[PDB]
Ligand binder design. Structure first.
Ligand SMILES: [Zn+2]
Ligand SMILES: [Zn+2]
Length: 77
């Protein structure tokens, strides 16, 4: 039924980024800047509108996050 997860380090620590973490390898999140591991643009992910040309966040269209559509897990490129 449930295929979730406690919450791996998939996400990059938000404290370490601004140098506000003293855990390092002990932290519960990733301390490496990855365009994949890091989360998407809360704005483009929520509002779906970001006028940023150099946004350090991921910009995904709200038209590629639908099940029905042919853009699914594998089906999608
Ligand atoms: Zn941390
Ligand atoms: Zn953005």
């Amino acid at each position: 039924g449930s295929s979730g997860s406690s919450g791996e380090k998939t996400v990059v620590c938000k404290h370490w980024l601004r140098g506000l973490c003293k855990k390092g390898d002990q932290c519960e999140f990733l301390h490496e800047y990855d365009m994949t591991k890091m989360p998407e643009c809360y704005f483009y992910s929520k509002f779906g509108e970001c006028s940023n040309k150099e946004c350090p966040f991921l910009h995904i269209d709200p038209e590629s996050k639908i099940k029905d559509c042919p853009w699914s897990g594998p089906s999608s490129g």
